[PDB]
Amino acid sequence: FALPFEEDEKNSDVWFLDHNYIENMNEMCKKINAKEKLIGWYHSGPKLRASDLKINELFKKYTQNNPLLLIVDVKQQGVGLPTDAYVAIEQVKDDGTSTEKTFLHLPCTIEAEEAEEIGVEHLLRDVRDQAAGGLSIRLTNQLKSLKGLQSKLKDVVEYLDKVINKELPINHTILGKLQDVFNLLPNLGTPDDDEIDVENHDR
């Protein structure tokens, strides 16, 4: 549910949140279904901001969990779901700098009520080409996946380029997964990759 909210665009360091409303509003949520409590806040996107760090303080006096940040992209951009999800963490930084407050990524997936689920399908009338059906559908998805990989992978090469020519700060935590891409990487001409051919001949 909405909360009355104002954001100043000239100077981003001033905002309006009404603390009084939230409590009242929560009470009426209990009318609906009293299994609901405040567990975070939605943001309207299109992206993360670093002024979100300051907003976040206010909602720690409401919650029983570390508050939720959900970007609902209203223009519906992304090649999968159009939501990123983050949670505020306080942590020491190991690159020799002080304790930051920072938003670390949480994966997004969906689960829904059984009831809700028949409604979603009810409004909709697409045949889908981003979900799998018949043979032809799965060829379209096959190609989409490969081009998806192309897009993300391209972005990695240019990210590496930025650190040593434009000077983004090294972050060991990110590059550390990219090393593991190499160690879990397949190899060619091993007795594993020959089992791989023999299985094709079987099928």
Partner: peptide, 25 residues
């Protein structure tokens, strides 16, 4: 192999290997 920290040199080493795999895709 165990992860480790990453310096400038290592950045480029890995970068180059991404270039081949980009083409292949």
């Amino acid at each position: 192999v165990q992860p480790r920290i990453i310096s400038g040199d290592q950045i480029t080493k890995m970068k180059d290997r991404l270039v081949e795999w980009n083409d292949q895709v």
